[PDB]
Amino acid sequence: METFLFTSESVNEGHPDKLCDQISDAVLDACLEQDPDSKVACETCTKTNMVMVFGEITTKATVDYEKIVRDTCRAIGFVSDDVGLDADKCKVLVNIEQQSPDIAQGVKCPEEIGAGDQGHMFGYATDETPELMPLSHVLATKLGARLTEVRKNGTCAWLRPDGKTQVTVEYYNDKGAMVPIRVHTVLISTQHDETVTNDEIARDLKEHVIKPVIPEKYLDEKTIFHLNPSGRFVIGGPHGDAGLTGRKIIIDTYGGWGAHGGGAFSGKDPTKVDRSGAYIVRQAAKSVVANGMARRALVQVSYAIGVPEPLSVFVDTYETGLIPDKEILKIVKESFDFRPGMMTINLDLKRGGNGRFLKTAAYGHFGRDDPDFTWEVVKPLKWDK
Amino acid sequence: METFLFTSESVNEGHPDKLCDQISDAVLDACLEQDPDSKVACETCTKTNMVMVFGEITTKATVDYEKIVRDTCRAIGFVSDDVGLDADKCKVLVNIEQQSPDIAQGVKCPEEIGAGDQGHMFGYATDETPELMPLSHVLATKLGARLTEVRKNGTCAWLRPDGKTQVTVEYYNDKGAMVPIRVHTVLISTQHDETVTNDEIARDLKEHVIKPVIPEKYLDEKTIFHLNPSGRFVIGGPHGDAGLTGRKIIIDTYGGWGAHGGGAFSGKDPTKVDRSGAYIVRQAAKSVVANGMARRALVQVSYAIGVPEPLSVFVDTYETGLIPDKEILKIVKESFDFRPGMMTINLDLKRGGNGRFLKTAAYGHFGRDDPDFTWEVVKPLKWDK
Ligand SMILES: CSC[C@H]1O[C@@H](n2cnc3c(N)ncnc32)[C@H](O)[C@@H]1O
Ligand SMILES: CSC[C@H]1O[C@@H](n2cnc3c(N)ncnc32)[C@H](O)[C@@H]1O
Ligand SMILES: [Cl-]
Ligand SMILES: [Cl-]
Ligand SMILES: [Cl-]
Ligand SMILES: [Cl-]
Ligand SMILES: [Cl-]
Ligand SMILES: [Cl-]
Ligand SMILES: [Cl-]
Ligand SMILES: [Cl-]
Ligand SMILES: [Cl-]
Ligand SMILES: [Cl-]
Ligand SMILES: [Cl-]
Ligand SMILES: [Cl-]
Ligand SMILES: [Cl-]
Ligand SMILES: [Cl-]
Ligand SMILES: [Mg+2]
Ligand SMILES: [Mg+2]
């Protein structure tokens, strides 16, 4: 059997770019909870002992930006200089242009709202996992989630918030369909405290993190482990290392699989086609596979600023479709509503008070079962033949 | 003939994210010109009347960060509040952690330098253009370059620095090979002054920008034009609209084609595998096509922090290879040196004083003929059959 190697990575919630994604989305959730019609373009950056929130917000909400920044950093575990940021003592620069909505006298609907911007977005799904995501991505991501879980529940209390994971999967190509064979290489680089030796780190990473996440059927005697390969990782997060919102867009999506149109997600209100557009084409691709029309699917949509209808749509099944891609294109366009005002309503994205977007801003926007992830709910599609 | 629609976009040099890419790379070029061994991780952000440079630099160079920021903004055309930023009067926050190199007493080589970080990078090429790039991307990009050129040379002196472009191409799939048929839709949204009417804008965009860029063979009576579809665009750049380094990674690469591993380019010294890794796999994919082994090619490499040899390589020819992909993989691994210390030397990326990286930070890193773009030079490869 001829195989190939495909790699995906992940970063932990304490990675300084991901910290900025989560702060940007916590700000957005706090605006939506009071004012579902908030317009939010909230950018975060960070460096040693500093966070700055900036960009533009129109809302009726009353939001304590500084407090959201501090609460988000503290819940991640950034509780002191030693761990890489003191939530309680660090400089927080509040640099948002805040506006209340327009006040007007006399003088449209969701169907006719133009896109807020131009751009293009891709959706992907594959039958290789139950969540219809690529294995390389799913295992990298779940190793990062697991690190956060065993730190916080005290099973590995030596851990610190920052770190990175990476998984190389050996695949077979069955006529366009991706058949994962085995895990070829596992890389973990995790922040940690000064108590723990290199040998305790390696042992706890194998037993408490790798073994519970990666199915035994994919691991064998030839799988390569790199555990903290560059030595000690005591200093982390923003300390000596700048973060920005929107710098982990491939970890937020498909790990190198499918495609990306370039738009970041976090800190954007869900009327923005970069977010609502990407979410609906995930639901489309996922619904193409789950209904049995194909084993894999890629969908692109594109927009013009001020135009409601998409400029272009396309479907690619990598020759796995059981009916022609032109027909799947027709069924996608018939079943899904790509108009920006309608996508936000149909995926119920403005509904407040469940920390929905803060949930998406670590460990991926796709492949999760959480009921706030409305784009992960398969639409039944009619097809035949 | 069955066809499909594929969209790519571009943003102009005055777009506030792209402004941050260029400031980050101008800082890097100024460090390299004096000290080729500079370590540079220089992040830029911008909002109304402000730029901030931040991140981390170790160098022997003497660099005037504020002056680089002002000179870069001024050369773009940001000369007043009205145009969207005053290069001469705006706030510039210099927030870099600057270090001189380590001073040490007594006690390696390029072959053994470990990667500076983990990650994965993709290279793509296609025979559909002379520059072996996707047409959608090449036409979007060249419409943006043209806007900048007719502003600055005074042919359309009503233009302002900001703007966006987008091109939908109608393609045929010849057995894996992309055959562009026609341009389906052209979108231009350009900043402008208060003199010019909507009709003069539309007329000058068709005659001075579209007609010179897009070959007549691809344009017909059914091609859709969207010219400033959302009305007037007088305010632009950072004014009312935040920019960050590394937010246009798909415009920097392949416009949705091929794949992306997630790493931004700008503000990073070329020892960083995100940059040197991506550049060499562009040269690999481009060399696979140009030598005639395939019509299209995708190459992935991946790294572990502190490990010199890549964790994984793969080649995909989309079934256009004239010899098996496993054999092309073998010829790529034999001909190219993926070790981080060797890639920087082989592509001569530390050589200073030609504004090399500032050139890459607008209108794409790939498909340009400029001799500083060493990754665009095809390597002769031995193959046969
Ligand atoms: C190379 S430093 C940049 C990134 O790599 C990771 N990193 C930082 N320090 C270390 C280390 N000592 N070992 C491994 N990875 C690290 C962190 O998540 C950081 O965001
Ligand atoms: C939607 S505003 C965000 C981006 O869209 C573009 N833009 C800003 N104002 C306008 C406008 N009036 N018409 C079209 N595009 C715009 C700019 O390049 C900006 O970076
Ligand atoms: Cl403060
Ligand atoms: Cl308003
Ligand atoms: Cl939008
Ligand atoms: Cl400790
Ligand atoms: Cl450390
Ligand atoms: Cl829908
Ligand atoms: Cl979940
Ligand atoms: Cl100043
Ligand atoms: Cl040093
Ligand atoms: Cl690196
Ligand atoms: Cl004017
Ligand atoms: Cl305007
Ligand atoms: Cl080489
Ligand atoms: Cl050029
Ligand atoms: Mg980063
Ligand atoms: Mg932006």
PDB file of N, CA and C in Angstrom, chain A residues 29-65:
ATOM      1  N   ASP A  29     -18.987  38.436  22.881  1.00  0.00           N
ATOM      2  CA  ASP A  29     -20.071  37.739  23.618  1.00  0.00           C
ATOM      3  C   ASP A  29     -20.679  38.696  24.639  1.00  0.00           C
ATOM      4  N   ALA A  30     -19.861  39.503  25.276  1.00  0.00           N
ATOM      5  CA  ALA A  30     -20.353  40.456  26.312  1.00  0.00           C
ATOM      6  C   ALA A  30     -21.222  41.523  25.613  1.00  0.00           C
ATOM      7  N   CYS A  31     -20.853  41.962  24.425  1.00  0.00           N
ATOM      8  CA  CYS A  31     -21.693  42.966  23.646  1.00  0.00           C
ATOM      9  C   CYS A  31     -23.037  42.311  23.243  1.00  0.00           C
ATOM     10  N   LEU A  32     -23.005  41.080  22.696  1.00  0.00           N
ATOM     11  CA  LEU A  32     -24.192  40.396  22.149  1.00  0.00           C
ATOM     12  C   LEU A  32     -25.151  40.078  23.278  1.00  0.00           C
ATOM     13  N   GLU A  33     -24.657  39.697  24.462  1.00  0.00           N
ATOM     14  CA  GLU A  33     -25.522  39.314  25.577  1.00  0.00           C
ATOM     15  C   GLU A  33     -26.485  40.441  25.882  1.00  0.00           C
ATOM     16  N   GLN A  34     -26.053  41.710  25.866  1.00  0.00           N
ATOM     17  CA  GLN A  34     -26.995  42.819  26.129  1.00  0.00           C
ATOM     18  C   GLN A  34     -27.642  43.304  24.808  1.00  0.00           C
ATOM     19  N   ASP A  35     -26.942  43.297  23.680  1.00  0.00           N
ATOM     20  CA  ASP A  35     -27.400  44.005  22.450  1.00  0.00           C
ATOM     21  C   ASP A  35     -27.098  43.079  21.283  1.00  0.00           C
ATOM     22  N   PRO A  36     -28.033  42.195  20.895  1.00  0.00           N
ATOM     23  CA  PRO A  36     -27.774  41.254  19.800  1.00  0.00           C
ATOM     24  C   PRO A  36     -27.423  41.899  18.469  1.00  0.00           C
ATOM     25  N   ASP A  37     -27.752  43.182  18.317  1.00  0.00           N
ATOM     26  CA  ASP A  37     -27.497  43.920  17.076  1.00  0.00           C
ATOM     27  C   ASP A  37     -26.158  44.658  17.141  1.00  0.00           C
ATOM     28  N   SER A  38     -25.260  44.330  18.074  1.00  0.00           N
ATOM     29  CA  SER A  38     -23.963  45.024  18.196  1.00  0.00           C
ATOM     30  C   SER A  38     -23.180  44.839  16.899  1.00  0.00           C
ATOM     31  N   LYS A  39     -22.488  45.892  16.480  1.00  0.00           N
ATOM     32  CA  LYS A  39     -21.459  45.760  15.411  1.00  0.00           C
ATOM     33  C   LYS A  39     -20.109  45.775  16.078  1.00  0.00           C
ATOM     34  N   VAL A  40     -19.353  44.715  15.860  1.00  0.00           N
ATOM     35  CA  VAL A  40     -18.139  44.462  16.657  1.00  0.00           C
ATOM     36  C   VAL A  40     -17.033  44.113  15.666  1.00  0.00           C
ATOM     37  N   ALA A  41     -15.940  44.859  15.707  1.00  0.00           N
ATOM     38  CA  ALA A  41     -14.659  44.544  15.021  1.00  0.00           C
ATOM     39  C   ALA A  41     -13.588  44.819  16.074  1.00  0.00           C
ATOM     40  N   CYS A  42     -13.352  43.837  16.951  1.00  0.00           N
ATOM     41  CA  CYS A  42     -12.526  44.010  18.166  1.00  0.00           C
ATOM     42  C   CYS A  42     -11.232  43.213  18.030  1.00  0.00           C
ATOM     43  N   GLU A  43     -10.136  43.955  17.847  1.00  0.00           N
ATOM     44  CA  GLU A  43      -8.775  43.417  17.670  1.00  0.00           C
ATOM     45  C   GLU A  43      -8.016  43.472  18.995  1.00  0.00           C
ATOM     46  N   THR A  44      -7.302  42.421  19.307  1.00  0.00           N
ATOM     47  CA  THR A  44      -6.490  42.358  20.561  1.00  0.00           C
ATOM     48  C   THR A  44      -5.014  42.202  20.134  1.00  0.00           C
ATOM     49  N   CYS A  45      -4.103  42.909  20.807  1.00  0.00           N
ATOM     50  CA  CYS A  45      -2.697  42.480  20.814  1.00  0.00           C
ATOM     51  C   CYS A  45      -2.154  42.395  22.238  1.00  0.00           C
ATOM     52  N   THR A  46      -1.033  41.720  22.340  1.00  0.00           N
ATOM     53  CA  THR A  46      -0.369  41.456  23.643  1.00  0.00           C
ATOM     54  C   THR A  46       1.150  41.378  23.426  1.00  0.00           C
ATOM     55  N   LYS A  47       1.896  41.808  24.461  1.00  0.00           N
ATOM     56  CA  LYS A  47       3.361  41.596  24.627  1.00  0.00           C
ATOM     57  C   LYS A  47       3.647  41.604  26.140  1.00  0.00           C
ATOM     58  N   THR A  48       4.887  41.539  26.510  1.00  0.00           N
ATOM     59  CA  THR A  48       5.292  41.421  27.951  1.00  0.00           C
ATOM     60  C   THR A  48       4.518  42.454  28.801  1.00  0.00           C
ATOM     61  N   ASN A  49       3.705  41.988  29.739  1.00  0.00           N
ATOM     62  CA  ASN A  49       2.985  42.827  30.730  1.00  0.00           C
ATOM     63  C   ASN A  49       1.989  43.795  30.071  1.00  0.00           C
ATOM     64  N   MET A  50       1.416  43.470  28.919  1.00  0.00           N
ATOM     65  CA  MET A  50       0.464  44.405  28.282  1.00  0.00           C
ATOM     66  C   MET A  50      -0.579  43.671  27.424  1.00  0.00           C
ATOM     67  N   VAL A  51      -1.839  44.106  27.522  1.00  0.00           N
ATOM     68  CA  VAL A  51      -2.819  43.769  26.464  1.00  0.00           C
ATOM     69  C   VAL A  51      -3.386  45.087  25.940  1.00  0.00           C
ATOM     70  N   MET A  52      -3.682  45.154  24.656  1.00  0.00           N
ATOM     71  CA  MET A  52      -4.417  46.322  24.098  1.00  0.00           C
ATOM     72  C   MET A  52      -5.587  45.806  23.306  1.00  0.00           C
ATOM     73  N   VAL A  53      -6.800  46.281  23.640  1.00  0.00           N
ATOM     74  CA  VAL A  53      -7.997  46.013  22.815  1.00  0.00           C
ATOM     75  C   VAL A  53      -8.232  47.254  21.976  1.00  0.00           C
ATOM     76  N   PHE A  54      -8.557  47.055  20.715  1.00  0.00           N
ATOM     77  CA  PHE A  54      -8.713  48.164  19.742  1.00  0.00           C
ATOM     78  C   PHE A  54      -9.686  47.715  18.666  1.00  0.00           C
ATOM     79  N   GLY A  55      -9.881  48.611  17.698  1.00  0.00           N
ATOM     80  CA  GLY A  55     -10.899  48.457  16.642  1.00  0.00           C
ATOM     81  C   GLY A  55     -12.153  49.258  16.982  1.00  0.00           C
ATOM     82  N   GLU A  56     -13.339  48.760  16.588  1.00  0.00           N
ATOM     83  CA  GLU A  56     -14.531  49.617  16.433  1.00  0.00           C
ATOM     84  C   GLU A  56     -15.744  48.852  16.931  1.00  0.00           C
ATOM     85  N   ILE A  57     -16.565  49.487  17.741  1.00  0.00           N
ATOM     86  CA  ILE A  57     -17.802  48.844  18.278  1.00  0.00           C
ATOM     87  C   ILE A  57     -18.907  49.874  18.246  1.00  0.00           C
ATOM     88  N   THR A  58     -20.053  49.485  17.662  1.00  0.00           N
ATOM     89  CA  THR A  58     -21.308  50.211  17.822  1.00  0.00           C
ATOM     90  C   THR A  58     -22.240  49.314  18.616  1.00  0.00           C
ATOM     91  N   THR A  59     -22.721  49.769  19.760  1.00  0.00           N
ATOM     92  CA  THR A  59     -23.594  48.940  20.599  1.00  0.00           C
ATOM     93  C   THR A  59     -24.403  49.800  21.553  1.00  0.00           C
ATOM     94  N   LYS A  60     -25.476  49.217  22.063  1.00  0.00           N
ATOM     95  CA  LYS A  60     -26.213  49.742  23.216  1.00  0.00           C
ATOM     96  C   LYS A  60     -25.669  49.110  24.491  1.00  0.00           C
ATOM     97  N   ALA A  61     -24.898  48.029  24.376  1.00  0.00           N
ATOM     98  CA  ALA A  61     -24.427  47.312  25.580  1.00  0.00           C
ATOM     99  C   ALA A  61     -23.529  48.222  26.428  1.00  0.00           C
ATOM    100  N   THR A  62     -23.382  47.859  27.697  1.00  0.00           N
ATOM    101  CA  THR A  62     -22.435  48.486  28.637  1.00  0.00           C
ATOM    102  C   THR A  62     -21.419  47.428  29.030  1.00  0.00           C
ATOM    103  N   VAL A  63     -20.215  47.519  28.478  1.00  0.00           N
ATOM    104  CA  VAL A  63     -19.232  46.427  28.589  1.00  0.00           C
ATOM    105  C   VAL A  63     -17.975  46.973  29.231  1.00  0.00           C
ATOM    106  N   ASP A  64     -17.443  46.239  30.201  1.00  0.00           N
ATOM    107  CA  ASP A  64     -16.227  46.642  30.908  1.00  0.00           C
ATOM    108  C   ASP A  64     -15.056  45.949  30.169  1.00  0.00           C
ATOM    109  N   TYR A  65     -14.530  46.579  29.157  1.00  0.00           N
ATOM    110  CA  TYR A  65     -13.476  45.960  28.323  1.00  0.00           C
ATOM    111  C   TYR A  65     -12.324  45.498  29.216  1.00  0.00           C
TER     112      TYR A  65
END
